[PDB]
Design a protein around this ligand. Structure first.
Ligand SMILES: [Cl-]
Ligand SMILES: [Cl-]
Ligand code: NA
Ligand code: NA
Length: 129
C-alpha cells in the first residue's frame, strides 16, 4: 500500500508515534517519505547482504529475520515480511524499539541526511489529525 502523507500521519499518530521519545510526528513522516516513498512494500539490499524492509526500511542485520542474513539478529522478533503489510503496526512497534536503543532517529540514514534540522512540521501541514 502506498500511503498518502496525511493518511500516514494519522495512522502513525494513532499508533503512538507523535512525540515518541521526543520525536514529533513530522519527523516520522519525513523519514518514511525518504526511506520508502510511503510504500509499505519497499525493499532494498545492502552491501553486507542484509536487506531493508517496509515503510521505515528496517534492516535484517539486526531487527528482523529474513532467512538469508547469516549471523544477524532478530531484535524485534518478527519475520521481515511482516514489515511489508498494509497494516503498519509491526513496523511501528519495531521502530519504537530502534529509536529507544540510544541513537534516536539517527539510526535512519535518510532522516539524518534529509530531515534532521529542517522544518519537519511541514510534513503534517494541512492534515486533519
Ligand atoms: Cl495501518
Ligand atoms: Cl534522542
Ligand atoms: Na512535527
Ligand atoms: Na536478522
Amino acid at each position: 500500500k502506498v500511503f498518502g502523507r496525511c493518511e500516514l500521519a494519522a495512522a502513525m499518530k494513532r499508533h503512538g508515534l507523535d512525540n515518541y521519545r521526543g520525536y514529533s510526528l513530522g519527523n516520522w513522516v519525513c523519514a518514511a517519505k525518504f526511506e520508502s516513498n510511503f510504500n509499505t512494500q519497499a525493499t532494498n539490499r545492502n552491501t553486507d547482504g542484509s536487506t531493508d524492509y517496509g515503510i521505515l526500511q528496517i534492516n535484517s542485520r539486526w531487527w528482523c529475520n529474513d532467512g538469508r542474513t547469516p549471523g544477524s539478529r532478530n531484535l524485534c522478533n518478527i519475520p521481515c515480511s511482516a514489515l511489508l503489510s498494509s497494516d503498519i503496526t509491526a513496523s511501528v512497534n519495531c521502530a519504537k524499539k530502534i529509536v529507544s536503543d540510544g541513537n534516536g532517529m539517527n539510526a535512519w540514514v535518510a532522516w539524518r541526511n534529509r530531515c534532521k534540522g529542517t522544518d519537519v512540521q511541514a510534513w503534517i501541514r494541512g492534515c486533519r489529525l
